[PDB]
Write a protein that binds this ligand. Sequence first.
Ligand SMILES: Nc1ncnc2c1ncn2[C@H]1C[C@H](O)[C@@H](COP(=O)(O)OP(=O)(O)OP(=O)(O)O)O1
Ligand SMILES: [Ca+2]
Ligand SMILES: [Ca+2]
Ligand SMILES: [Ca+2]
Ligand SMILES: [Ca+2]
Ligand SMILES: [Ca+2]
Length: 901
Amino acid sequence: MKEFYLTVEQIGDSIFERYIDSNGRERTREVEYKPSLFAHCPESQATKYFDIYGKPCTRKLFANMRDASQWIKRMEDIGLEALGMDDFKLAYLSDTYNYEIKYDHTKIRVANFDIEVTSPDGFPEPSQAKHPIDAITHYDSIDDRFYVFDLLNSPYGNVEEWSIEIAAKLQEQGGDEVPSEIIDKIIYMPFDNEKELLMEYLNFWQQKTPVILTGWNVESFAIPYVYNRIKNIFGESTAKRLSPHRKTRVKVIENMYGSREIITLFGISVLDYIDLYKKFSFTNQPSYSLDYISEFELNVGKLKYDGPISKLRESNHQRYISYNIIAVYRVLQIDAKRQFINLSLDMGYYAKIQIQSVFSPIKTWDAIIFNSLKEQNKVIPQGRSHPVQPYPGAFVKEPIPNRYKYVMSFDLTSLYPSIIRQVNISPETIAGTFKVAPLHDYINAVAERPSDVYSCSPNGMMYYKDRDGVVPTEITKVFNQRKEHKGYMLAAQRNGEIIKEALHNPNLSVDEPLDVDYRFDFSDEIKEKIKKLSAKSLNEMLFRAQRTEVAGMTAQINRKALINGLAGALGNVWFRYYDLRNATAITTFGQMALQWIERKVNEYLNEVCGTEGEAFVLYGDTDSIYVSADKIIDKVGESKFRDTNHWVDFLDKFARERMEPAIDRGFREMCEYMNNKQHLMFMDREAIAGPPLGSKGIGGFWTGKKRYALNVWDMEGTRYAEPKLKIMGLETQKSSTPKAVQKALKECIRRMLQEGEESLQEYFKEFEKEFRQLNYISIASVSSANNIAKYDVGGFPGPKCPFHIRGILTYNRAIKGNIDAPQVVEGEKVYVLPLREGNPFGDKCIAWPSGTEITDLIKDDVLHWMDYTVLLEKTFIKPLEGFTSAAKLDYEKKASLFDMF
DNA sequence: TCATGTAAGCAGTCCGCG
DNA sequence: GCGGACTGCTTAC
Ligand SMILES: Nc1ncnc2c1ncn2[C@H]1C[C@H](O)[C@@H](COP(=O)(O)OP(=O)(O)OP(=O)(O)O)O1
Ligand SMILES: [Ca+2]
Ligand SMILES: [Ca+2]
Ligand SMILES: [Ca+2]
Ligand SMILES: [Ca+2]
Ligand SMILES: [Ca+2]
């Protein structure tokens, strides 16, 4: 097999590399890597190395990496550019793996671990590590085993061995319900003292040294705790055995309001799953407790135990250990679904970076571009200092707030990357500038044509047309990967809808789910077999289809994020290719493109309808337009349609056969106007929206920019079994809105769009009457909690104290003098409830850590004093009033003449 | 919240507005 | 009481 790296590090003048050799074995080597850098040279000096602008360079080979870094410093002192890859391990990888890396995940040791620490005096701080580690569960992907290290004897209690037999049993048998599928994979090791536990753990770690290390909050808790505990007990040298090269660094992570400390383990790639989830999931959750996320992702119940976690080991050690094991497994289950480890390996090996660098699009693109240029013997420019400067972004149309009955949307494929490719925007393709007219002059095609030689953006920039820039070349490759995975995702989505349709008529039989590839549209034969299947088999197929769709989503949306990140990186001062001329060239072209096509679409539809100056495009944001289809439907007449699917088909055909060709014509004209390199503005129909045929539903409404709701029947070629609400920006979509209120507002919207005013009024009246019965957590608002200390003046709110911070201060006074009470953590999320006048907490609100029940001491008082009236007005009535006013509807029935009867 | 970008919405504070 | 200046937070793209 072809060799591939696992990890790479620079340690002084040595590269330390762990890798898989040509025989599939894990090896480690130390290489005295001699790096090269470059200086500009005279044209008279023969060279094969050129900078990205075509200027010749001489290669300077250094005796060692320290000599190279010192030379960079002297070049700065002289005032001359030091060219080339200054991150020497990236240069090392580029030299050692000069080919497309084909990796074998089965040879990569991925470790998932979690530790338990009993602490009677509050949260066990990793920097202090003053409490015994009393459990470790460490799953190894190569062995496919859960290694459980269990401390039986502690200063906080001596306990009996954990029983795998009790662990396997149902909760109703007094067991822990450790999943049957992992029972045989547990290797259980009890210890009579912590020192022997940790020594054996370190010997185990040496034998099975993680390449990828993950788990939940491992970077902020488990790793620093283990390192510091071992350091406290045995000394520094023993703790450094967590590094395969015996090197570690206490790294300071700095944010906007303070800093924290993590441990860098050289020769390991730490991918904390919480960080993977936050970057790659495209959710924003009210809580990031593993219990909350597992419930959301997997629909598994909360891990239930009695009393505080600080007493769980002594009261129920059996459950304590079982829950530690289950916690490790839940992360594996989440990854089986989301496939973020797979994604990270894919992206890391593609770029030729340390795997943990996938968190940084700037590092990722620096490496991709470096490797691309190196292939052509080209030499990358030195990174420079730049001041942070604001620059303009996208255009968003101000919509007229209203109901909109029939709506068809259109969207540009991968807009910013397509602009880069179309215009040929790159550091080395800049050709010059032209005199800019106001943007509206280009939008309306009255400005002088910018250039008859170069490819242009309406910000004034011109680009070469003779050859593709490196940025267009490399962005195209990732775009093409993204396109492939999106195809799989949408096929799985369409396949899911076939199964949902079939589930209306399930067969009374005992059978099995079909062995099919959900990434490809079901054949006619498969469709015929599905129509004969039982509900049990259909539901299992639906689950598998939906899991295939999730895998495709992960692969596609994050490749989209990477390419959109390149466009953004051009406007970040730390990017080697930072250039506000290129950043603005993209965004300004986008503004023109959207408004140009708005004009073209309006012109086209006014022509086909025989009107003048009427606005068909009701809204647009960045790269999408929303077109009113009322007149198109009315031109045939609603009574002519058999059912909802009939007018959906009609609009689908109209958009494809009439509108898309007109849109294409309009964009081809724009491409010629700007003299662009290649026409890549591909705007396709996105959504078809409207009320059910014959109903009193309103179909859709807008309240303002980035705030709308649509009843969608078909999305990007997926014809839904049941209509789906597309809601953007409204309170139903915000993590700050109480869970039960999101639910109620969604139903209000569903009723407005699908059923009408009377239906909405019925539901409102019921919700208002019954809502006080809702569980307090379900009606609590949520907020991130920053700068608690800044607004704290002797335990009371200082000037301009935010409402949620006021709540935290109230909580802190209520729990004061109790080391055991859950503390609110700076920068994390809190639940927030309003409090009625004259409550014993002495303020108008209270807040506590999100994802948790409020502590028993004050729970009863919170429940008694919760201000239901305020909660309802703020989270429910105020937003509903916004929706209904925009839609010209009433959520409460107005008085009429019929009342007199 | 260490980690690519901008536009823009709503909650809430403070305070003007005769 | 609503709106502007401002902070804080959160989405849409
Ligand atoms: N996270 C982001 N970072 C930077 N720019 C972004 C981000 N999201 C969106 N944009 C910008 C660049 C996009 O090309 C443009 C339009 O976004 P959007 O319509 O979501 O997707 P897209 O057009 O890039 O891809 P798609 O092919 O899925 O439509 O907005
Ligand atoms: Ca735990
Ligand atoms: Ca798009
Ligand atoms: Ca699309
Ligand atoms: Ca059937
Ligand atoms: Ca869009």
